[PDB]
């Protein structure tokens, strides 16, 4: 999988350059993964000049005129011959009309034999037609326009009459061969490409991925002008946005034509698609490619200081008229005479090329892709975030993007526009009028507050400027399930980013964000000029009362308001409609502001959900093509949480004005309590509500609120299809659910219980994260926690059996609840049915990080699954290499499972190999999409020394896997693990979700030998209570989905299915068994048996029965016993054994799969909304297998270590003797070495070998992952470049890179080194010699490099470790640096602090002399390794050197250092000295 | 992060010393002072799930506030310092907070988090002080319901339960009426429950304050032969049964026939009735201060009694009782959320 192109700067045109693109298809072919057969084309194609020498050979008859006055279509077709010449027809007359003659047709020889049966199967008749244009048309843009105008109208006539074609490409300058192929079959199936005369300037190329294994040809690319890299996650919002603009473009090149061409995107096509119809809409209506790409994907302006003042004002104007497609984009466009390449703003993508002297140009993902002269090469780079790389062939020159983004911003004067046209709402100073009611609490009832609310979540934002944390994720039920009367927002689930697209840290990367909002009406987008930015802008879409107020009495003609009350009686839907008729007249009449207001409500008349009304009134304006023409504001009681404000800009809001929150805020101010003022405490609750959406934006990678505000972010649970259709448009809604009369009941109840209320004057107490008596239900309740905990105490059954039945029955608390067996089967005996032994080896612990426990807790756990013989896993925390060896007494506390997540924190050589799973925590159900903050106080010195960290120390664990930034990188670090530990068995960890199956199925294809579903409901140690609450989905819909579509794609039989999140009763597992896991994973519950009794005081590390803290007073309370856990799980598997029995199942992989065991409870049907809910979706079974029986094999044989390096250095390696080997290597190479290392930890351990024991040279390029998990004792050496991922995790060893001996270029203005190195890594040293990229060091904990430049993002979560810069650093350097020290060479020592983060590092100068003879020491290996020319210089100049060098450290770490060292000097032992040091800066 | 339940220990409030409390039938208890209330609520979690509220059933058992009072939400607030607040939320479970402050044996207490390894919070002790503040700053006072639709439950006994559901059907908006047998109100609280556990003065207030709100207490009427049940269905709506259970069991064995034994719930009757009337100067009552006492039995009327005996200064008195002494810490089948069965050393 990627994307690639070979050109010739000048334009000239051979065969070779189709021939290496070819062949640098087949060498990016091994990122791919593997299907259910290898020679089934998973997607491919090939973009090319039009090939008129090639044409005139092969025709003989059709009269071809000169170049650019004809074009070439290319057309796939259904096998069936009558709607083919149809459609032939059809077309000639719609070129006739145009006026454009009809040259001739062409049929494409195909070489069916050569492909898959799949894609046989699917061929297509490929012909083509050429066109001529008209000797009207003086410029080929128009005849260009033409044939766009032809192929838009052909597509409209094939979709409105049901045929099915497809124009692969239509143009006078490009042609596309592309489809279900790999890289061999392209060139076997397009005999054509064969032919010699087959000339073009350059060749673009791209292979797929196919997540799923049912794609199509049309969705393969190269699209009709651009490849595309990545993937969308604003593709709903951009969708609807498109769509609004259409009905008001108008554009004078078109003419007429725009009523011709009015759908301009497609709505079944996938994401690249509608992006290259997009674009090629923009650019054939007057732009240029260059500024339509940065139009599309602009550069982030707000809160970027590194930017040009005519670049900021560029893309500030053009923000008022274009969303961002955000998310991972690599896109390489091309119109013929011009090409352009450009990254996504954050860059998460790779992306190198190489120039050469001969004017040629090889750009690709990879960079070992073909092989070339070094004496030839001439530049070796990257392409940077932010900038374009742009040639044109007509031109002969590569045109900077420097040059380029100044004539494009300098065209127009965007910056005196923006001054001169921007309106100002300045409100009146005398005009403050603090509201209140008088019916606060009437109202507050109406809107469902609570004491618990207020108390726990508004109090607590003004306190501390961000959203509560919380424990324990939700145990209670869906709303849909809920007796209680329940807010349309709870039904309502935020969505994340687990694979295809990485979660942002909004915090760390606040310079890629922005909350910029825009109100008013957009200009003419096509022709812009300076009413397009007549319009008001905020930084913040939570509107204060004053700000509410002076929009409303801005009166201004051109700015004009209407207040629409959006209340209902009886009929929601006619209120609905009495809201789109308001707001058509006021559109009619010029207003260009729609403020939804609840207010002047009353016992007769209820407020519509504000979620409800938000999203009809914008889907009716999207469709009417009116919403551009307005703003949305919303002033609604029912908004007081950061999910609440997240779903209404999703849905559609731009601005939300929480008048109830002030009041209630006020009234606080008032009665005495919340000391601070009304002033503050709005103006904080505004800043902690943006931060809080922006986390939740950032959760699905969105960096925007711009896009986030059209895009849909939210998954309905309980919601019937028709009105998600209605209202909700794109939401997803597996099971339907409830009514539009059901929704207008519940709220027209909780309005009339309110309004009356006549016997109290307080709120009731919430039961949202507290279990009150007589509130909404728990789980896990007092009488459940006593039940299990005494039943586990006896070691008795009868206790056991009542805690069951009062989890399982008496109430509905998971969708699994409304289902009951059937109950006419032949019930066996209890002797017939597999062993409560082999039964609980399908069971785990599941993950709890050592540092949110305690040392006692995790070794109990631990302790209990080795004696059962399940599985315990070690969180994101590391291990203690102690617990690797059992104790004299029999018991084990090592963990059979070791997580792997974005920190990295204890990950090693040892680590890996001592285990026999490693799971990848790609998400958890509480925090899917975030991160996490240990801070220093919380970071004791016990467990700093085993995350190897500093004690007192902050740690910050990023959200996102810096590797993962796709599918390919996931099987990437799959085939890492994999060779770190041949003998595990690797799993994938995810979150229920939307099209987790398909998420599922391509990570089968990325060959994960498990795959485990969480629930929602899954606990946490620490989380935000919003993100515990209204994030994930049931585990139940999830698990379905994976199950049947890894069996209709063939691969369920690959796959180990694993699921967790409230698993507490056989019961549970027998529904898990049922729906597909088998596998079962129990976290909260073995907490309760130790002593747990659900406190949610996790995150306080004040737990009273000493399970989740670590502070020794509270410890000494753990009475936990591995016993109790031994007789939950076997209690457990005796109840799934009796279930067994029941329905008649002799074992486990029998009863897996058997849905139609199961039916709809008749309290299901009973219940007044759980009723109207679709089962059947969970309820199918499609013909196939339902166990996992293949091995997942993988490609360990075939590797160069077990090929070339092993059976040279297995002996080396027992005997304990120097080695030194060497080989050439290409990029198909991808670990190299990573194997060796695992051996050598193996047999020796942490203390490995002697340094420079094993030597391993490799000359070439080198592929992903080099030098992966190296421990001591190794030394790589690398004659050439590397690729992304060198030096992933080390756990000690040397890696050198040096440049290629032929390439006689400056190394330091060279790139050598792939973008993200040495994440995670531990110890060891590097040197490599040139230029990095993106994401350097990222998560380095003791590993000391020298670099010559780096990229942005450079030493971002360092925690320990040295990192020196012999060179230019990029913005956003030491961002989250939390340990470690940066030593940084540069001349202008204030760019250089403009470029770091200065928000917790300081800067000083290299005045220790140790400190000096160490980065002297350095810089003298480096040179004596490397022969690097910048370091002989600067050791010649040493004196300047060390006055030039710039020192980059963190505060806190430098002060813990410093007081260890004083401790020390004073005669303190180390452990006494650290505790003390410990406790002084942390009391 | 609070750690009060670490760096903070159980105390008491002032009491009387125990000599010289047997001179006068007075409080035995005091509520806590401002700091010390403030101390003893900081050491309350906040707790998930609170224990302390579940109000059931355990093993036979009561464990929590059968109410479910709000008891960390007015410890937060007692801490903080917000007394009416506190008051406003106790009131809105617990209509009688006074009597249960100092008369409540406090299963809350005996089930909770904090119970497990270390003392629980005087959760009984923290009531008392609210409402005494408030009872003191005169916060209480009657709601008068605006609204009143005639309709009448002619309530009968004016126990605990019987002051509950008056109250809360005048708030309603119901006229309803309470038959009492015995001269002055209040059921078991004005007679059974000892003057020392609860004075009669508190309870007496508590009644001015019902009748203010309108319940009309009728006393001096058994309603069997003075009031029939078929003229009380005819003049009302609905009835009530609010009796209590007075009915004691006897031992059926020979020797308890000689003049000298008497009912304890009839002795403890005659003596406050006979200390409200005239001191225990009218001699209407059973005086054993001469005279050696056996109550056999244990519980709260075996503890009553022989506070009223040694008030009483009898020679000698001494409790007798079949089940086996409590030790002195939990067993291995009785652990927290159970009720704690351990020795308590309570008064008397
Ligand atoms: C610390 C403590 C100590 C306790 N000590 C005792 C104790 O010593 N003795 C004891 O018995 N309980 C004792 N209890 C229990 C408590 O007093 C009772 O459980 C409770 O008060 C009775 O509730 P009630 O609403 O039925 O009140 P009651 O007083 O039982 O309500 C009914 C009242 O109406 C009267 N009545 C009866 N028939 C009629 C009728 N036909 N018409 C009108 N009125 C009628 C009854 O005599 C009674 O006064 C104690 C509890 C605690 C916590
Ligand atoms: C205290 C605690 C800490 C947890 N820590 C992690 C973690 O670090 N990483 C992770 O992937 N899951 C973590 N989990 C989630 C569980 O490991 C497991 O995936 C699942 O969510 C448990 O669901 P359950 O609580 O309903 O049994 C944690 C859960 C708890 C209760
Ligand atoms: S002391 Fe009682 S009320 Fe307070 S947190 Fe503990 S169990 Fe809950
Ligand atoms: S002491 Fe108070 S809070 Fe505790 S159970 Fe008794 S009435 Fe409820
Ligand atoms: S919820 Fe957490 S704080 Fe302790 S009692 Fe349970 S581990």
Known sequence: CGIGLYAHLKGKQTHDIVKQGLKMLCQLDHRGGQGSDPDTGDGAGLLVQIPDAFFRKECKNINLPEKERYGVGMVFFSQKEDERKKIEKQINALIEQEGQVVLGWRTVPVNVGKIGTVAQKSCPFVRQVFIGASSDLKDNLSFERKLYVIRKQAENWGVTEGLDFYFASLSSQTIVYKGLLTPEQVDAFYSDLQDEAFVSAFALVHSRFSTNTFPTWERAHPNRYLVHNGEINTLRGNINWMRAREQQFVSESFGEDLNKILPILNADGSDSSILDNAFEFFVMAGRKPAHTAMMLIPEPWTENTHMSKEKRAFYEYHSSLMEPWDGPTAISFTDGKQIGAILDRNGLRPARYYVTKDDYIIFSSEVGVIEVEQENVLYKNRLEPGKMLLIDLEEGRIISDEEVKTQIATEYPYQKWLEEELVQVNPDPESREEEQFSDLLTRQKAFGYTYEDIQKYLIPVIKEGKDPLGSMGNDAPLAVLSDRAQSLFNYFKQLFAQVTNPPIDAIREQLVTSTMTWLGAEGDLLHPSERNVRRIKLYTPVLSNEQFYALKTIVHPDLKSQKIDVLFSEDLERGLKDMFTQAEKAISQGVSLLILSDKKMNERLTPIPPLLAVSALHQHLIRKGLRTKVSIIVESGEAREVHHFAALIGYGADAINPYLAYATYKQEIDEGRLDISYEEAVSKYGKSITEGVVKVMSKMGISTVQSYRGAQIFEAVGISRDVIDRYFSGTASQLGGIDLQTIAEEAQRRHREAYQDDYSKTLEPGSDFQWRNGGEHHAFNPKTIHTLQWACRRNDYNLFKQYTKAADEERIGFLRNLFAFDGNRKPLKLEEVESAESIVKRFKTGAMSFGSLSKEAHEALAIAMNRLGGKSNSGEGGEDPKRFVPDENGDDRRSAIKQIASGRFGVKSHYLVNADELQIKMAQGAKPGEGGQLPGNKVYPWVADVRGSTPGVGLISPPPHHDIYSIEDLAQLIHDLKNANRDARISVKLVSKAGVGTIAAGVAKATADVIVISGYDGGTGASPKTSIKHTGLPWELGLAEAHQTLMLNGLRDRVVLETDGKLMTGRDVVMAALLGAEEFGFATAPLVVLGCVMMRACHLDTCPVGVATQNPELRKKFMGDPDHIVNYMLFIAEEVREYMAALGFKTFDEMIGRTDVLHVSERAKEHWKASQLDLSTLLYQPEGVRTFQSPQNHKIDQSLDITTILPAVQEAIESGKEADISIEINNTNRVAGTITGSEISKRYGEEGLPEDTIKLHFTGSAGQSFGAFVPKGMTLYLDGDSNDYVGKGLSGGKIIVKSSEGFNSASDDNVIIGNVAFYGATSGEAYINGRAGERFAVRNSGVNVVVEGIGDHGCEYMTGGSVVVLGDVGKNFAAGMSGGIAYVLTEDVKAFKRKCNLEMILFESLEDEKEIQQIKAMLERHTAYTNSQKAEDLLDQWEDSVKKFVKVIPKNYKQMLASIEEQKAAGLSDEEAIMFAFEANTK | ?348
Not at chain 2, 199 to 204: A, D, L, M
Request: charged letters at 25%.
């Open chain 2, 1 to 348: 992060k609070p750690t009060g339940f670490m760096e903070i220990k159980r105390e008491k409030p002032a009491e009387r010393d125990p000599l010289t409390r047997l001179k006068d039938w007075k409080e035995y208890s005091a509520p806590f002072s401002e700091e010390a209330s403030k101390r003893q609520g900081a050491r309350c979690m906040d707790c998930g799930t609170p224990f302390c509220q579940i109000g059931a059933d355990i093993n036979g058992f009561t464990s929590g506030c059968p109410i479910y009072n709000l008891i960390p939400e007015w410890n937060g607030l007692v801490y903080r310092g917000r007394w009416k607040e506190a008051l406003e939320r106790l009131l809105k479970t617990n209509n009688f907070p006074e009597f249960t402050g100092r008369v409540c044996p406090a299963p809350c207490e005996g089930s909770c988090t904090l119970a497990i390894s270390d003392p629980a919070v005087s959760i009984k002790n923290i009531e008392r002080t609210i409402i005494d503040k408030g009872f003191e700053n005169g916060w209480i006072q009657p709601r008068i319901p605006k609204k009143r639709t005639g309709k009448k439950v002619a309530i009968v006994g004016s126990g605990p339960a019987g002051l509950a559901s008056a109250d809360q059907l005048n708030q309603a908006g119901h006229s309803v009426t309470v038959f009492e047998r015995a001269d002055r109100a209040g059921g078991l609280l004005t007679y059974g429950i000892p003057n020392m556990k609860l004075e009669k003065g508190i309870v007496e207030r508590r009644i001015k304050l019902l009748t203010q709100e309108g319940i009309d207490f009728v006393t001096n009427t058994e309603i069997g032969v003075d009031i029939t049940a078929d003229e009380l269905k005819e003049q009302f709506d609905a009835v009530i049964l609010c009796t209590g259970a007075q009915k004691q069991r006897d031992l059926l064995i020979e020797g308890r026939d000689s003049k000298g034994v008497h009912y304890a719930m009839d002795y403890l009757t005659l003596a406050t009735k006979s200390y409200l009337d005239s001191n225990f100067k009218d001699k209407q009552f059973i005086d054993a201060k001469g005279k050696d006492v056996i109550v056999i039995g244990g519980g709260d009327t075996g503890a009553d009694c022989v506070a009223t005996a040694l008030r009483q200064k009898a020679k000698s008195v001494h409790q007798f009782g079949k089940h086996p002494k409590l030790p002195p810490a939990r067993t291995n089948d009785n652990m927290w959320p159970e009720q704690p069965h351990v020795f308590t050393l309570e008064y008397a």
